[PDB]
Design an enzyme around this catalytic site. Structure first.
Site, PDB file in Angstrom:
ATOM      1  N   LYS A   1       0.885  -1.177   0.000  1.00  0.00           N
ATOM      2  CA  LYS A   1       0.000   0.000   0.000  1.00  0.00           C
ATOM      3  C   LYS A   1       0.928   1.235   0.000  1.00  0.00           C
ATOM      4  O   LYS A   1       1.834   1.341   0.841  1.00  0.00           O
ATOM      5  CB  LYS A   1      -0.922   0.018   1.233  1.00  0.00           C
TER       6      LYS A   1
ATOM      7  N   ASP B   1      -2.265  10.289   4.002  1.00  0.00           N
ATOM      8  CA  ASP B   1      -3.687   9.965   4.123  1.00  0.00           C
ATOM      9  C   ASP B   1      -4.391  10.997   4.981  1.00  0.00           C
ATOM     10  O   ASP B   1      -4.359  10.914   6.201  1.00  0.00           O
ATOM     11  CB  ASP B   1      -3.892   8.568   4.685  1.00  0.00           C
TER      12      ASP B   1
ATOM     13  N   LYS C   1      -9.679  12.926   8.626  1.00  0.00           N
ATOM     14  CA  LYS C   1      -9.221  12.423   9.937  1.00  0.00           C
ATOM     15  C   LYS C   1      -9.236  13.612  10.904  1.00  0.00           C
ATOM     16  O   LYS C   1      -8.223  14.261  11.117  1.00  0.00           O
ATOM     17  CB  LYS C   1      -7.821  11.787   9.834  1.00  0.00           C
TER      18      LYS C   1
ATOM     19  N   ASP D   1      -1.353  13.297  11.951  1.00  0.00           N
ATOM     20  CA  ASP D   1       0.058  13.711  11.979  1.00  0.00           C
ATOM     21  C   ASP D   1       1.037  12.563  11.665  1.00  0.00           C
ATOM     22  O   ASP D   1       2.200  12.811  11.346  1.00  0.00           O
ATOM     23  CB  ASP D   1       0.411  14.378  13.332  1.00  0.00           C
TER      24      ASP D   1
ATOM     25  N   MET E   1       0.226  10.144   9.303  1.00  0.00           N
ATOM     26  CA  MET E   1      -0.175   9.640   7.977  1.00  0.00           C
ATOM     27  C   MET E   1       0.826   9.656   6.833  1.00  0.00           C
ATOM     28  O   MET E   1       0.559   9.036   5.807  1.00  0.00           O
ATOM     29  CB  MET E   1      -1.599  10.041   7.610  1.00  0.00           C
TER      30      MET E   1
ATOM     31  N   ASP F   1       1.644   6.044   5.768  1.00  0.00           N
ATOM     32  CA  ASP F   1       0.670   5.244   5.026  1.00  0.00           C
ATOM     33  C   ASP F   1       1.205   4.571   3.747  1.00  0.00           C
ATOM     34  O   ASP F   1       0.471   3.870   3.054  1.00  0.00           O
ATOM     35  CB  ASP F   1      -0.618   6.030   4.827  1.00  0.00           C
TER      36      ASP F   1
ATOM     37  N   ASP G   1     -11.921   7.498   3.579  1.00  0.00           N
ATOM     38  CA  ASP G   1     -10.768   7.142   4.426  1.00  0.00           C
ATOM     39  C   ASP G   1     -10.491   5.636   4.402  1.00  0.00           C
ATOM     40  O   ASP G   1      -9.515   5.186   4.986  1.00  0.00           O
ATOM     41  CB  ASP G   1     -10.933   7.700   5.862  1.00  0.00           C
TER      42      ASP G   1
ATOM     43  N   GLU H   1      -9.444   4.252   1.780  1.00  0.00           N
ATOM     44  CA  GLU H   1      -8.829   4.374   0.468  1.00  0.00           C
ATOM     45  C   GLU H   1      -7.865   3.258   0.100  1.00  0.00           C
ATOM     46  O   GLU H   1      -7.717   2.980  -1.079  1.00  0.00           O
ATOM     47  CB  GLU H   1      -8.157   5.764   0.313  1.00  0.00           C
TER      48      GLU H   1
ATOM     49  N   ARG I   1      -7.856  -0.002   0.572  1.00  0.00           N
ATOM     50  CA  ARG I   1      -8.470  -1.175  -0.050  1.00  0.00           C
ATOM     51  C   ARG I   1      -8.848  -0.942  -1.521  1.00  0.00           C
ATOM     52  O   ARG I   1      -8.842  -1.888  -2.290  1.00  0.00           O
ATOM     53  CB  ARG I   1      -9.650  -1.703   0.777  1.00  0.00           C
TER      54      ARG I   1
END
Ligand SMILES: [Zn+2]
Ligand SMILES: [Zn+2]
Ligand SMILES: [Zn+2]
Ligand SMILES: [Zn+2]
Ligand SMILES: [Zn+2]
Ligand SMILES: [Zn+2]
Lengths: 516, 519, 511, 48
Positions: free
Chosen positions: A289, A294, A301, A309, A311, A314, A374, A376, A378
């Site tokens: 991923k 994010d 969020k 903070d 993200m 991700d 959020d 996202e 998947r």
């Protein structure tokens, strides 16, 4: 290739350190039976006392120095104990009338150390290296370790010792000085020698993944991250392909493209390939991923505890996959073909973003109703999985910081593994044991599939609380007839106490590729 | 028609619309119950009740023109079954011609007069017998008393609930989806009910068309594609149309409506459709629908738990009801009336270009408005649409909008709220509610709350500091944009979405058509 | 009767002021045609301007003082404007060299004043009264008001002027009124004084905190009121409530240190009974919410002493009815009084309780306690064999979102009764709006285990669902439910309104 | 009854039933009108 900027001060690349001070350490492994020479820097004994909880320190090794041997006699050592992680420093003159620093790290009273116990030993040894200007460290193993745990000791030592100063300008550590030599004394040394360069490769894969994760979202964006993957592929002589928006539209990657709609950075799909010279017996696709930031999108969020903070982390899955590409490209395994994939993008708020409720079409023709922007990861993974399956591989393994519920189910130490094939799950569990990166098998509960039934689209992106399981059920719909496993690293990727990434999954995925 | 902007080539450029539905292929025949019931192919359902006797036995009163079926349906055979509202049973037997026939009933309870809610329960039970059974025909025998309007409501509800929207299905279409081709109806004084059949079919389509627009997600149904769909509808019905673009909206000084759409990638599109009767025009009406294709809340983002941001594609339900009404009016062609179908269509988004909380904006009538919350966008778009409507010189202005979340707390999911400045117009809406069977309740515009909209800087505040009577305060704000015309406002925020069935209701189409027709 | 105490400092009664300074005001009504006399105190003209922004103040009345007439000339008054509630008043010497104060209250530009507009006029008048040591106030009506609105003016003036100093540790003696057709308005004066006291009495009970006003002290205060008015009274204690099987009401009070007290007052009219009425008031002396504690932001736990406002409105009505003595009507004044607390003894969410009519109720939320107490009070009221049952309660917080702070909601099972309440609302000037009982929502009260659920899961339409629950406890009697949760407390003035007293009295009187 | 492979496929009854009326009701032509979707049901009253 060209990274877009809002202002001229916006960075256009991720700074990457390839030649680290760890790579300048000359490592020598000696057999403990020939005795220990205590000549300079610092000599640390790794000592335990089986049965006797917080028992006395007793140095078993022969030391080839009369003065040092005297200092280390049982009568002098009995005042010190083996409590796990305890350490002491000693100062004395050796036979050559030179000052020498010696010490020990307590390894407790349990004969077999776990990965968690070994980490505590390494952390204690690392406190002895920090704030002490040394040219050399010698480690004397008076504990029992197998080949995998010895390698884990070195990888962990190298990783923890290394300090990331890429973003320091006026606050660089003026007293930063790394050892130039590492001496290791162990029983049956010849069997452990091959672990040294393997540990150095594993350390760099992990550290490289860590550098990408720690790099903030202004530095590490879809363009700069795919550029870094190209540079890595060129250095390793790996085949590479970066798919841009036009190619992604032709491939009908609607789920992945919708996520990136609100970003100023165009989507970049990374495809690196390693192919063994010789007959290919196993074909593997590793999918990471790659969300560079994010925000949550329109489902922002904003809730307390949503960790916006953090993200920049991700893209940890993509970083683990690229770190694995470094290890595989360096170690060059035989009879394998490995595809290193990542659908890289950024999840942002804009007039151009996808919305909650939007119906989007994945590359396999499945229509998806977006219930929450959020979720996202998947969506990007659905199109990456369809792409991976079209490659005609034996195994598809995805790794992703997918669900926050992992922190509530397994916590920060163990990642969760889900899959459609028991043999593949077992191979991941075995790779977890040899890499010492802990993973626990979690179920894909088929009874929850009905919660993804959409009134309008073919499927719902989300259910409308077993989030990590529902996310796995969604991903399962994008793999038709291939053995697939999904590793949710949302809980394990970030080391909250040390305020840094772990580079989790590099060693796990490399052991998986190598031991196949 | 305008070109729909795209971020990626995979972004849709139109709303898929099904005009020729399987319901339109159903041949409906109405027979008088006095001539007896013929029981052949398909499924024959008796609608039975038992007044007084709660969960009383089933008794079939109609003469059935088959000795075998009559014998099966005798009192002694039927007494083991009861009339409990929504209950149903299936029967199988051989008729006089040695052919297998499927018969059954739907229980209609013990109350002689069924409410719209009770009739919906009967229809839902009937629909469960149609689903998962490949039938060429359904026959319905009315052994209950229904007036002309309730009979039409039965047919509309049956058609609407039976219809399955598969526009967004690709790999998951229902392989067993098969519709009846024939519908037989037996009822007492059948000749009086016959005229309701085609009216029900038109009302069903107006409602279903509105439903299709509402259900269509915000990437498919945006201000450009929604105004393009309104143009296509107008062209098919031979209605006059005008779509006002940004340049024209700027010339008209529609600052409140334009500010809402500033943050969107889709340019604002103001829909103006007109139906004009061929003869002398005796009444002029403007129907105004709220047309927010997606409501994120703007900078006052819908981030609070329970703010239902995932449902916000439904924020153009008012516009959809108005367009569904245009379909019914354009098809039925009422005399002596001129109807204007209006919607200030836009999308409420977060961008560097969005309007901000605190911004002072100027409406087309010159009133300055202080924006207290970007999520109270509906009243801003409606303010400029109301100024536009009044400039048309109409007798009545009726607006319909998913305006306030508070409607869910005040009237709930079944009854919409009506507010207005004119009692005669409110009573006409209440009468249209009775004949359409779309429930509405009259709520007050409390003048004492007007002082809460006094702004320190602008001529008026968009919102109260709260107060909390949100639906009433929103109505007080709207009232400031209608100077000398009878006006009513229908808040459908609570009734538009069927939460249990996970689909829109197409609420307001029948209500507004009955209003136009019965004037 | 004896109020339990935790410490000796805990109060054992509600202090009540019966003889107020308003009762000492001598009121005189005069025709405006004969001119106004300005001899003492303050004289205020109620002036509007049909066609204004607001426009200038212009006094139409003839004044019998050369000095005062000169002050009131068009050129001077034009410097002032008629904006609703705007006032100015000046002190000067009259013809007899005596100190007089003269001013006006702006009445806007609308010829027909609403109850809200009249309240603004009164507030402006009261501000002048609170900051001036006066012996007399004279009000000159240069606006058109009907008899009911004129009575509302007087009641509002008396209520707003009065200051409650019972918990703290000067007034005019005369009121002059100049109005066109003064003979027509005279009978409204003493009726206004009675309406003021019932409203003020209700306000005193509401404002009294929960340590002072508890189930025992409130039922003791109701007995004292009944004794003063010669009303029949009965207080039902726990033993009697257990015999009557009032399980829903008794469950609510389980967690309280104060025993439940059921108030039953009765007024019997002289002459043949043409209508029998039961007035039921919610009497929660303090609502903590119980185990479903009012802990959420905006849950207003600090205001919960007001949760007996329904009971207070009913007792205030008993004062007005007992004083005015209407004929051909029998009235029952009821309240199932208790306190909703957190204790080892409290009822819990999920508990199944049995009402006095045998219906089992599943408790979904301990904070929906009002409907439980009302269910048993409604069963009791119906057994009295009355023509109408009217309940009044601070039942649902959702009223603040639906009608707000000015209009109460009315729900019912009988259109004729609802219309009588709306009519009483019109004549009392206490605004009420008819809200529906939507039968489609009844299925949300179907319990898996008990005969009925107390609440709907979600609710959605909370005030309607509460009305559907209450409707289950009235079998064959015309019944109406007035939800006053939004209107009872005056948030801006930080005091109760005593809402419902005048509405219920007008209902009883006009029947 | 199920239908392996054929997703939401038709209902087909294999068992022999010792009643002529019920055997006729259970014939393939009648049963194919119905499908095997998990939990879907149909039941009819008749004379044996
Ligand atoms: Zn996310
Ligand atoms: Zn994510
Ligand atoms: Zn909004
Ligand atoms: Zn909206
Ligand atoms: Zn409560
Ligand atoms: Zn309460």
């Amino acid at each position: 290739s060209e990274v877009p900027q809002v202002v001229s001060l916006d960075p256009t690349s991720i700074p990457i350190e390839y030649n680290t001070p760890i790579h300048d350490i000359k490592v020598q492994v000696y057999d403990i039976k020939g005795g220990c020479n205590v000549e300079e820097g610092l000599t640390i004994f790794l000592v335990n006392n089986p049965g006797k909880e917080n028992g006395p320190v007793k140095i078993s090794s022969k030391v080839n120095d009369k003065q040092v041997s005297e200092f280390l006699k049982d009568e002098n050592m009995e005042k010190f104990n083996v409590k796990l992680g305890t350490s002491k420093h000693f100062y004395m003159f050796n036979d050559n009338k030179n000052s020498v620093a010696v010490g020990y790290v307590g390894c407790g009273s349990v004969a077999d150390l776990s990965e968690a116990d070994m980490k505590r030993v390494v952390l204690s040894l690392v406190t002895m290296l920090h704030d002490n200007k040394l040219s050399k460290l010698t480690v004397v193993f008076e504990i029992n370790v197998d080949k995998n745990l010895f390698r884990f000791f070195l990888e962990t030592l190298f990783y923890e010792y290394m300090t990331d100063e890429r973003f320091k300008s006026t606050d660089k550590n003026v007293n930063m000085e790394y050892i130039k030599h590492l001496g290791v004394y162990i029983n049956n040394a010849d069997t452990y020698k091959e672990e040294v360069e393997k540990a150095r490769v594993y350390y760099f894969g992990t550290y490289y993944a860590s550098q990408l994760i720690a790099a903030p979202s202004n530095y590490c964006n879809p363009v700069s991250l795919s550029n870094a993957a190209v540079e890595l592929a060129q250095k390793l002589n790996l085949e590479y392909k970066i798919l841009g928006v036009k190619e992604l539209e032709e491939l009908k990657m609607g789920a992945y493209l919708s996520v990136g709609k609100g970003s100023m950075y165009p989507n970049k799909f990374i495809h690196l390939t390693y192919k063994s010279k010789g007959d290919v017996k196993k074909k593997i696709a590793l999918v990471g991923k790659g969300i560079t930031f994010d925000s949550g999108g329109y489902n922002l969020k904003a809730a307390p505890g949503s960790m916006i903070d953090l993200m920049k982390f991700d893209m940890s899955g993509c970083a683990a996959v690229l770190g694995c590409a470094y290890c595989v490209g360096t170690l060059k395994p035989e009879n394998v073909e490995i595809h290193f994939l990542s659908a890289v993008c950024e999840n942002m708020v804009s007039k151009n973003s996808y919305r909650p409720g939007d119906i989007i079409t994945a590359s396999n023709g499945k229509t998806i109703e977006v219930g929450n922007t959020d979720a996202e990861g998947r969506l990007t993974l659905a199109d990456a999985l369809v792409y991976a399956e079209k490659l005609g591989v034996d195994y598809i393994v995805d790794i992703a910081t997918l669900t926050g519920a992992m922190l509530y189910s397994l916590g920060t130490s163990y990642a969760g593994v889900f899959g459609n094939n028991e043999e593949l799950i077992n191979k991941i569990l075995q790779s977890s044991k040899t890499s010492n990166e802990p993973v626990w098998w979690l179920p894909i509960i088929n009874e929850y599939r009905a919660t993804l039934n959409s009134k309008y689209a073919d499927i719902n992106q989300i259910s409308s609380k077993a989030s990590s399981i529902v996310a796995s059920l969604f991903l399962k719909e994008f793999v038709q007839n291939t053995a697939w496993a999904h590793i949710d690293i949302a809980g394990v990727s970030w080391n909250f106490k040390a305020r840094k990434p772990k580079g989790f999954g590099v060693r796990l995925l490399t052991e998986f590729v190598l031991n196949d």
